[PDB]
Design a protein around this ligand. Structure first.
Ligand SMILES: CCCCCCCCCC(=O)OC[C@H](COP(=O)([O-])OCCN)OC(=O)CCCCCCCCC
Ligand SMILES: CCCN(CCC)S(=O)(=O)c1ccc(C(=O)O)cc1
Lengths: 488, 165, 95
């Protein structure tokens, strides 16, 4: 029976999702003596194969009850391993972890999608011996002193297959811990192996964007008033073709990532900025063929945006890459909020200075007074007892009040940023850069919009036991003296 | 070594009577005054302070400089290109120095009436200022997160190593 | 015998440097009952003087396995002092 009403569904309101069936309830509550009874009784046995209204099995439901606290993780992990061991005795022909829910997710793919890093790490690195050895995903190959060599099962992990764990962590997951998942074994060494065979293509793509932006800059600097004329024409059609090529490549990115589009740019706004640069480039060439003066502002905005776009390729090196992540500290989250308060002070004092400066005994417009008031924030603000005005003393007191209020606001804003950002939390910038490398690679593995390249499998097809049990397995060598010496 | 090389080269260029001896003599003079800061290690009070003043390595400022020079030169080529039309950003050096002046509290903002596209020139300047202040604020906060972590002050030991060398 | 192939050398890759000889292995793994057997047996005694392909003795190899954590330090220090005490009984003429 499926308890399927709105109280039993997963949502932000008042609910208890456990799957929908007794067995999934008994597992999610940790009643291991009810689980074995429901499975092993003669009257009506539960099946580990049974699914709820989302297509979730009890193993999917266990991934759904996981938080990343150590007690909840230990309890989900014990129940999950127990139910696999039970399946190995009660339905030995059935691969319970190959069952997909209605979203097309296995329990490992669901753990990756929902950001359940503790049960995700557990499933991905799982090992057993004797009767349960075929339930492993990790197999020790040899161990000698501080060195362990292991084979890891890549079956639903490698990006050669559609909708893999790597594609899910990069593009379908929206959890803040995505960067912690890509640095686990075997994903860490697997993504490094993919990076090391694609790094030459990354810097070829950078060199092509440098050559495009060099030509863009040389052409924008040599615009005429509204042999060298033929080279300037060649430069405009190279900018048009590079703009069309980048536009097609970016429209193709957002088409491939359409099902998850609102997250496809969330840590990857350079896909918006490369699309916008290509649009403004093509529009500037259309306006240039129409001979309208407004082509030059669009060409110049495309030029600035194209130099800012070269900062994308800083992720190709560890030294600049990780720094590009450290420099994200102060999000627009606080500066867009401070900007609301600051623009109310700016425009409130600007309308006041313009109104009061009308009388002589120069703040001539709202733009004039806003720019004079903004100059105080950049160290350039003029204070004078401005003798030609009537109410000059009140104009000076308005300026002194604006300065003191703005310095109170800026000092409050800076101190509030320090209280939020300087809290001695561990520097996760290396992991967030490994996630930027993962996203870049998983894109480069598809090739170009016009070239659509064929992929290759990673690891090797190897026998690991009986269930012969042959799998695509990836060899990882761990050296760990600190973990080894504690065993002696 | 560099001060001694530039000193000997300045005297060789002076014997050749070329004007470029004076830039080398003056660069050797500046570098020679900066070299007197070596001897601050002779006293505990200045020595240890010379070690405390190493906090902000070129490690982060050379990385910030890459981002900053892309903003600087990207907006400099744009301002020069757009200021060609009247209705002054005359060269890349001129526009780079005007854009750099915002970082030292000296940057001119004006609705620059003699230009065509003056409003777009002002919006480019306002965008450069806001981006540069976001970058500088991010750089300063990222330095605080790396450097202000309550680790023990090892500057006495690093000065004892300078004395040892 | 000197286990001297690229897995047994010290480098940034996948390796286990312990010196290259049984006695240096037995010391680097903390097998003090294997160390005294290899040193004191009648069939073929190990020498504390024996060196690997870098010229390292077991005392150099112990310095090479040291990290600055307190447990690894206590274990390297106990093994290092034990081997000097053993040398004072098995090769007393040798520094
Ligand atoms: C119709 C088939 C044409 C084949 C052209 C082959 C070009 C190969 C170079 C290439 O694709 O470089 C990628 C680069 C942008 O970098 P990115 O893909 O990582 O993207 C950034 C992702 N964040 O791209 C650029 O910088 C543009 C290069 C200039 C245009 C080339 C000629 C076009 C003719 C139509
Ligand atoms: C390919 C190298 C294998 N060797 C280790 C070299 C240092 S080995 O000595 O043959 C060995 C050791 C231990 C185990 C085990 O515990 O499974 C298996 C094989």
């Amino acid at each position: 029976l499926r308890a399927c009403g709105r109280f039993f569904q997963k949502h932000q309101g008042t609910c208890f999702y456990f799957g929908e069936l007794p067995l999934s309830l008994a597992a999610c509550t940790k009643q291991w003596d009810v689980v074995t009874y429901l499975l092993e009784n003669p009257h009506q046995p539960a099946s580990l194969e049974a699914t709820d209204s989302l297509g979730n099995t009890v193993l999917h439901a266990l991934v759904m009850i996981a938080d990343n606290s150590p007690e909840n993780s230990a309890l989900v992990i014990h129940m999950y391993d127990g139910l696999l061991q039970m399946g190995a005795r009660l339905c030995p022909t059935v691969q319970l972890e190959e069952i997909s829910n209605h979203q097309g997710l296995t329990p490992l793919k669901l753990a990756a999608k929902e950001g359940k890093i503790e049960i995700f790490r557990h499933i991905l690195q799982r090992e057993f011996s004797g009767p349960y050895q075929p339930l492993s995903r990790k197999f020790t190959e040899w161990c000698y002193g501080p060195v362990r060599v292991s084979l890891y099962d890549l079956s639903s992990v490698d990006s050669w297959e559609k909708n893999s764990v790597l594609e899910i962590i990069a593009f379908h997951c929206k959890s803040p811990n995505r960067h912690r998942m890509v640095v686990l074994e075997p994903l860490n060494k697997l993504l490094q192996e993919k990076w090391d065979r694609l790094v030459s293509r990354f810097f070829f793509n950078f060199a092509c964007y440098l050559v495009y932006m060099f030509i863009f800059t040389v052409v924008a600097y040599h615009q005429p008033s509204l042999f060298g004329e033929s080279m300037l024409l060649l430069g405009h059609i190279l900018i048009l073709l590079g703009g069309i090529y980048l536009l097609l490549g970016q429209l193709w990115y957002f088409w491939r990532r359409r099902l998850f589009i609102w997250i496809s740019f969330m840590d990857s706004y350079f896909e918006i900025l490369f699309l916008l640069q290509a649009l403004l480039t093509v529009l500037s060439q259309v306006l240039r063929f129409m001979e309208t003066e407004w082509y030059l502002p669009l060409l110049v905005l495309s030029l600035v945006l194209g130099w800012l776009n070269l900062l994308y390729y800083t992720r190709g090196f560890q030294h600049t890459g990780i720094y590009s992540v450290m420099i994200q500290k102060v999000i627009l989250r606080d500066l867009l909020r401070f900007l609301l308060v600051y623009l109310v002070f700016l425009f409130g004092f600007a309308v006041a200075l313009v109104s009061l400066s009308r009388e002589a005994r120069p703040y001539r417009s709202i733009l004039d007074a806003s720019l004079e008031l903004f100059k105080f924030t950049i160290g350039m603000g003029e204070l004078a007892f401005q003798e030609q005005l009537r109410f000059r003393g009140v104009v000076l007191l308005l300026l002194l009040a604006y300065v003191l209020l703005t310095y109170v606001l800026l000092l409050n804003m800076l101190i509030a940023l320090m209280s939020e950002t300087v809290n001695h939390v561990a520097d996760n910038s290396w992991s967030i850069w490994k996630l930027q490398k993962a996203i870049s690679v998983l894109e480069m593995e598809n090739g170009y919009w016009w070239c659509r390249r064929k992929k290759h499998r990673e690891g090797r097809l190897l026998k690991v036991g009986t269930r012969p049990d042959e799998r695509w397995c990836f060899r990882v060598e761990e050296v760990n003296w600190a973990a080894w010496e504690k065993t002696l």
